[PDB]
């Protein structure tokens, strides 16, 4: 019995710049109970048969969860660009797995704002697929010395989402889960029903 629900029905989600990954091995993943909810507005799979989702064996299955704005879910897909894809969470061009998202304004929003959720705004190079950057180092823009302190062309790499119930759906919070499947040369730890 595979405990997929705990990551979906989790109390608190992570920030996108520092997403949370959980390995899901030695379990039988019945994905039919995952399609139950109509709550997952954006459910897209990449590289898997439409019906063999529940009838397949995978060596490893990882989960990656975080919170972003509704208009940035389009960036949770292979071959995407933007602040989320280049700087926070990048799927590979050859990604194999599904992506689930759902509106959580009713939970991840506070009267006045819930600024605990952050996103990386600056970065020198783009993020490699499944590479996580949690460097809270001052970003140097051009040739201005920062001395570890903000200033001209010296800005804190992180920034905060301002989630409020009054915001538009494009700026409301959405909870994303990126089930990524792995087929390796080893007995499959994850097999479906």
């Amino acid at each position, epitope marked *: 019995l595979c405990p997929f629900g705990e990551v979906f029905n989790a109390t608190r989600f992570a920030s996108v710049y520092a997403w*949370n*990954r*959980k390995r899901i091995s030695n379990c039988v993943a019945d994905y039919s109970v995952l399609y139950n909810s109509a709550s997952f507005s954006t459910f897209k799979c990449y590289g898997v048969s439409p019906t063999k989702l529940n009838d397949l064996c995978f060596t490893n299955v990882y989960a990656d969860s975080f919170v972003i704005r509704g208009d940035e879910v389009r960036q949770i897909a292979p071959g995407q660009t933007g602040k989320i894809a280049d700087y926070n969470y990048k799927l590979p061009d050859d990604f194999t797995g599904c992506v689930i998202a759902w509106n959580s304004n009713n939970l991840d929003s506070k009267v006045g704002g819930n*600024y*605990n959720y952050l996103y990386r705004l600056f970065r020198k190079s783009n993020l490699k697929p499944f590479e996580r950057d949690i460097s*809270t180092e001052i970003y140097q823009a051009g040739s201005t010395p920062c001395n570890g302190v903000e200033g001209f062309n010296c800005y*804190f790499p992180l920034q905060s989402y301002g989630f409020q119930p009054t915001n538009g759906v494009g700026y409301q919070p959405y909870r994303v889960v990126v089930l990524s499947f792995e087929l390796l040369h080893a007995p499959a730890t994850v097999c479906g029903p």
Partner: antibody
Amino acid sequence: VQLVQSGAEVKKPGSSVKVSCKASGGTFSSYTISWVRQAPGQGLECMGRIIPILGIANYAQKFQGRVTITADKSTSIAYMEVSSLRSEDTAVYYCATEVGYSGYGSAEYFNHWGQGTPVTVSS
Amino acid sequence: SVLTQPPSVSGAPGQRVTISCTGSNSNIGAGYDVHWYQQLPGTAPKLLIYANNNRPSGVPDRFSGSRSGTSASLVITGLQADDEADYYCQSYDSSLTGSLFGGGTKLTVLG
């Protein structure tokens, strides 16, 4: 050692206490500030974090309303407070600087630790 | 979940010493790295190894780290009496949505 905390503190059950942290080997620059607790003869437990530059506080679930952490970037000092003290919360409380990196399995590590301030709760 | 450590390990001067840090899929099971700290009695912990295979300038050459799956190992090759201390490992847990320490191990140099 690496960051300077306040002095020792002895408090009665039900009191609240506030401790302070200042910087050695740095200037609080872009460093997240963590609070870790070491009970008597017991392992370490991280209860809180403060982002000085953004002023955003994240606390562990075992943290309740009771612990509240703040920090001033101007002053260069960081602080934490506990209310409704009891026998349980007797420990050396540490303030430490978190460090992040870019990588595939990135996880924060604490490079600088304070002196430790032992808070004892007794009647 | 949590990280598990030997409550105690004993070593003879000059021997190799292996301290373990095992975790479930919530922490070390995913890519999450492990970090080691040396803490002498009464002193504040000090960073010993970050990223497992890296040690800051000032950590002597005999400390190393290795990983293989859901476990992590701190090794002291040329054990010396200056190594009598507590050792904790630290990583991130997804269920906790935060950093996590281990139980610690007291290394008694039997010389």
